[PDB]
Amino acid sequence: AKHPVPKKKTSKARRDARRSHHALTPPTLVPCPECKAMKPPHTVCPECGYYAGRKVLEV
């Protein structure tokens, strides 16, 4: 109800310009040197991990 309040409605211009830098950055993906799935980097993602990595279900 109180002390700090919007004096005016921010229009489409200033609202959709303040929502410029809230565009999301696409994630980083690298192709996993064992088989070609797109892990993020430095990440033991569900293929093998690193060389001799900690396994989900594999030999």
Partner 1 sequence: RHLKSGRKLNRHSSHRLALYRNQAKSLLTHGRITTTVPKAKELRGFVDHLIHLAKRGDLHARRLVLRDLQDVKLVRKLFDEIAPRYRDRQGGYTRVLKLAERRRGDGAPLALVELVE
Name the site residues for partner 1 (rule: CB under 8 A): 39-40, 42-46, 49-50, 54
Token digits for 39? 């892990």
Amino acid type, 28 = T
21 contact, one of partner 1, RNA, Mg ion, none, CB 5-8 Å limit per kind: RNA
Per CB under 7 A, 14 contacts RNA: yes
Per CB under 7 A, 46 contacts RNA: no
Distance spanning both ends of the chain, measured CA to CA: 64
What is the chain's length?
59
46 contact, one of RNA, Mg ion, partner 1, none, CB 5-8 Å limit per kind: partner 1
Token digits for 21? 């830098």
